[PDB]
Amino acid sequence: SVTSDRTYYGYGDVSVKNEPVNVVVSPFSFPGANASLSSGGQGVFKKPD
């Protein structure tokens, strides 16, 4: 009578949500406060973070 269609199934799901990286920024204001930059001046400025 019944000629079974021999076909069973298995399934799965994958969730890719985020991007690998977050670039958190703290911008710099290099002449800063309690220091001074002059025209034609020479030197170095550094922000560690």
Q: Which residues contribute to the site for Ca ion (CB under 5 A)?
A: 41-43
Nearer to its own copies, 12 or 48 (CB): 12
The residue assigned the tokens 């911008």 is: 27
Binds 43: which of Ca ion, its own copies, none (CB < 5-8 Å by kind): Ca ion
Helix (H, G, I), strand (E, B) or coil at 19: coil
Q: Which of residues 9-48 bind its own copies (CB under 8 A)?
A: 9-21, 23, 25, 27-31, 36-41
Both tokens of residue 7? Answer: 């076909």
> Pick from 49, 2, 3: which is nearest to 27 by CA?
49
**For residues 10 and 20, which CB has a smaller minimum distance to Ca ion in the complex?**
20
